Subunit: 91 residues, 3 copies
């Protein structure tokens, strides 16, 4: 499991979400943030299984790019364990 | 130390905070977020730094308190932490 | 590659940002959060998220430790998180170093 943290432009969020959904990546959490490369941005936090890391990264790279300074970055973090609250079971 | 990141239903936050307190967990950071499991739903994100020996009990406290049994309950991620510093004193870990 | 997460007092943000800028650390993301410490009811804090290369970990941590301190309970903490890889969206460049 990996946790992907991506920072994108607010005006590209809808496009990014659509790309993610099409890539079959539906579990995600987002929030409004401010950043410096202060400007308003959107932060996506996505926990994915190993096979979904690239698909997720690519969905965002392609959908969030505008070619102008401020497009954002994508961090891939290691995750030791993940638990599903509904069942109280690990992974 | 490890960093616990839990996404729970807003209506379960109080129960979770109470269980964490009973489990001797005091240090925590939280914020409001939106999530998908097209339509985004309001959730609350808790971020808790906890030392190895007590990660399990802390996770268990959250799991028990945040569950409803219905889809939408959320998840708990346990991330490794390379180093932790206390800003008040500057001390490592 | 590391992701530094620092939680500081809102009244110390400007100082912190200045120290980071001076240390040549410009890339960062921040948001407002509510927190409780191991010692005293939540209080508002500013959470900074800073992705840095290995050589910039010490300088970044040092800059925050200097600027955000007051010596009183509530000062906050700094978490240095391991990062497997980082991608720049505009250039498509990836870092792992
Ligand atoms: N190092 C970082 N750590 C945390 N967040 C960052 C970092 N760099 C950028 N961000 C986030 O991404 C947003 C856009 O930065 P971007 O990566 O687009 O900056 P640039 O200056 O356009 O690119 P670069 O910094 O790679 O030259 C920033 O406003 C911030 O929200
Ligand atoms: N993989 C994920 N990455 C990041 N956040 C997630 C992920 N999965 C779920 N979440 C967060 O938890 C919230 C609730 O998820 P939900 O409980 O709907 O997960 P499911 O896997 O879709 O259903 P369930 O896990 O309950 O069987 C989501 O709205 C989101 O905020
Ligand atoms: N273990 C933790 N996990 C997540 N967030 C924390 C943790 N400890 C502290 N915080 C964040 O830092 C803020 C200030 O903490 P404080 O500085 O009060 O820590 P303390 O350990 O409780 O006090 P001190 O570190 O100053 O002796 C808290 O309100 C919270 O936002």
């Amino acid at each position: 499991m990996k946790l992907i943290v991506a920072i994108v432009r607010p005006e590209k969020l809808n496009e990014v979400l659509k790309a993610l959904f099409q890539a079959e990546v539906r579990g995600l959490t987002l929030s409004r943030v401010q950043g410096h490369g202060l400007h308003e941005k959107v932060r996506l936090e996505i926990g994915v299984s190993e096979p979904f890391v690239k698909p997720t990264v690519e969905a965002i790279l392609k959908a969030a790019r505008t070619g102008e300074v401020g497009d954002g970055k994508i961090f891939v973090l290691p995750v030791e364990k993940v638990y599903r609250i509904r069942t109280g079971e690990e992974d």
